[PDB]
């Protein structure tokens with residue numbers, strides 16, 4: 001070893017710095033008292049129980065864990081909950097380490113957080129403390145279904161972060177964890193009170209190739225993305241519709257590994273005004289208007305692939321800025337006889353605004369305001385006018401927030417937090433895929449939803465059909481297996 | 497050709513398709529777009545998911561609706577039509593009858609989805625000749641693969657020397673051959689005749705959990721709350737029913753623990769009350785559920801005789817309401833009735849040789865209609881979960897064969913359709929035990945059970961029974977772990 005006790009720079013001798021949260025960045029106290037006299041008085045007796053491991057791996061929540069520990073610890077459940085509340089109220093941030101962490105960030109970053117913490121705890125620590133900004137990737141046990149003593153969680157961080165094991169020193173107060181990091185070749189660093197001792201799957205690939213083959217055959221046979229319509233989100237008993245260009249636009253905009261021949265082909269079916277209608281020209285009702293959602297998404301894609309320029313787009317952008325309701329909010333159609341608003345349509349319009357350099361036009365203030373309130377107020381939990389699913393709002397919101405960093409910083413932590421609480425709260429592959437992508441683009445690895453996504457791939461490579469959007473006048477859903485597969489493969493792509 | 501060869505084998509394994517059953521696949525509806533051949537569905541990769549129980553028919557038909565560019569209602573009508581063409585191979589079922597009567601060991605092993613299998617199970621009456629039924633949708637395993645064969649040979653402990661498979665597919669019998677099993681193929685003309693330890697860890701970890709728990713607390717602990725998960729339950733360990741259930745249902749209990757829990761019980765009326773005596777509300781009565789279960793257990797362990805039991809059995813026969821059904825309490829000021837309690841009284845009654853007392857008729861009748869009417873899905877007065885009634889019924893039906901045969905096939909049928917229908921481990925374990933007792937292996941519920949064991953070895957708390965007035969759930973981690981372990985023990 002080499003006991004350290006003075007301003008050291010042995011750190012700068014390494015490329016990757018991995019932190020644990022406990023003692024190193026956060027300290028708490030475990031003895032607490034309530035009006036109830038029965039049972040344990042030290043929360044560490046819970047934290048050391050084996051049931052606490054289930055809670056750390058995401059396999060149970062705190063309500064479950066506390067009901068079991070009532071039995072095992074012979075303590076009223078309300079007492080354990082209250083001692084747990086008191087324990088986390090004693091949380092104090094180590095301010096030396098936090099300054100040393102802000103420093104490491106300021107330099108050549110490359111800092112990862114790898115802690116054992118249960119999901120609801122990590123949610124609270126995320127929103128209550130402001131040191132996550134210095135982390136390049138957050139690897140939390142509840143998001144991984146992995147617990148720190150086991151070697152497999154160590155193996156996972158080395159693969160996922162793709163870090164040279166020889167250029168790595170990992171900081172902890174537990175010695176068991178230091179030994180296992182040492183096994184893979186990572187230099188270690190104990191954090192005693194006054195001392196700082198120094199020292200120095202293919203199954204995935206099969207399923208990914210399978211699913212890419214499914215999606216390619218489907219979009220080569222139908223470059224115009226098919227769509228089924230039904231009255232439920234699983235589209236059970238859906239009938240073929242296939243007369244709207246929006247599914248094609250959404251696929252082009254979102255899956256990033258599409259072959260060149262498929263991009264050209266679908267991009268051809270779309271160029272068929274510089275404004276676009278929901279419907280295939282063939283299927284469009286007479287005097288049915290163009291909408292800002294199909295237009296925004298397509299223009300953003302054409303601008304992004306350089307098939308079009310800002311000057312080409314500016315006239316349509318002004319038409320959108322002149323499409324505002326009485327409250328100043330940009331509306332869904334170019335049809336003053338059909339005023340509608342929708343938060344996800346607003347996100348997409350604002351997205352193109354920022355793409356073309358119109359991001360600070362005064363006429364956008366009320367439209368961005370509506371999107372922010374729709375998030376903070378938790379209205380998004382009831383869906384938007386055309387998108388029932390709450391993660392779809394969080395998904396499109398995360399694109400605008402991450403892609404224009406300095407123009408949306410007030411959305412960042414609220415949106416990351418909303419996403420963290422929603423980890424693994426639904427079974428639909430498309431919603432899981434959305435959460436994996438968004439969190440990863442926000443710096444948080446969501447391996448739970450990833451694994452359960454792998455499990456729901458049908459044997460032909462594709463994922464089940466999903467009703468991503470809805471016509472509200474009849475609550476008729478639209479979807480395809482193509483859309484589901486397209487986001488699942490994107491989520492597999494962004495995590496491996 | 498006469499098959500004297502068959503008698504040269506101790507165990508015979510039947511496939512279902514073409515061997516026992518025939519169907520035609522070309523069909524027409526008022527809809528003309530799409531396929532005309534249902535075999536274009538069964539040969540699609542998505543069908544394999546359906547066969548392994550990973551998706552249901554609705555899912556599969558919506559996916560194939562899109563893949564086969566065929567309207568989904570057409571695919572459903574076509575599939576309904578294909579099933580109505582089903583024909584039993586009448587020669588084959590007569591062999592089967594013979595082989596069953598020759599006291600041979602006969603197994604069924606076929607790829608079939610769960611909704612089709614429940615229909616076949618009701619629609620045809622040749623399942624009685626089977627000793628175990630192995631079905632892909634219950635196994636989460638498909639027939640061509642090596643690990644469904646390996647699973648059959650372990651589960652049934654098959655002497656691959658003395659055992660002969662019978663199929664109509666060369667891929668199938670080739671795999672059967674590789675395990676040492678003689679293969680005999682079929683056709684309309686020719687009949688060709690050639691020749692995890694993870695589980696152990698979990699069972700060991702859970703046995704220790706339950707053992708320490710019942711050595712600390714022989715009177716099985718009990719928790720009261722208002723929901724089935726007993727979330728935020730308060731300890732109430734003042735009832736003895738839980739001890740009686742555990743004593744009566746877990747078969748690998750260590751002898752010291754039976755001893756202790758039995759001494760807990762006896763503490764001389766030969767009748768029992770829900771409450772520990774230090775908690776019995778003044779003038780609260782004995783009940784036939786606790787009394788029936790304990791007596792049934794004491795007799796089965798030879799701590800008692802039929803002769804000691806008859807007086808209280810006759811007191812039960814004298815406890816019938818005006819409709820003639822035997823009632824819950826030994827008290828005429830609390831007339832209640834409950835299906836499961838009647839099940840448990842009828843169980844003891846048959847145990848002591850009273851099974852055909854004419855006074856039991858109205859109570860057996862009541863139990864039957866509670867099943868056939870699907871009223872059990874609404875729960876009983878004291879037991880909310882529908883699988884609890886099916887579980888106690890299957891004990892009664894199976895342990896007294898030829899006394900309850902009208903129950904056998906309806907009850908198995910319900911159980912089949914409830915496979916993987918709830919998440920609660922205790923409910924999973926009841927379905928596994930009950931179906932296994934009825935000849936059917938439920939590996940689907942069993943694998944999900946193994947996922948929900950907690951790290952200290954126990955399963956989570958479950959509210960098994962209920963106080964209807966206040967709507968209070970009672971239960972424990974001890975009750976869950978006991979039935980989970982029983983289920984692991986029976987499917988192993």
Ligand SMILES: CC(C)=CCC/C(C)=C/CC/C(C)=C/CS
Pocket residue numbers: 246278291293294332345386387469470471472478
């Ligand atoms: C989901 C969405 C807003 C896509 C952009 C085009 C749009 C507003 C269509 C109206 C919603 C709808 C399906 C109408 C079917 S008549």
Ligand SMILES: CC(C)=CCC/C(C)=C/CC/C(C)=C/CS
Pocket residue numbers: 737770783784785786824834837878961962963964
């Ligand atoms: C032991 C058991 C479940 C019997 C089912 C019939 C019975 C006597 C119920 C009384 C149990 C109870 C919930 C009493 C609340 S005061």
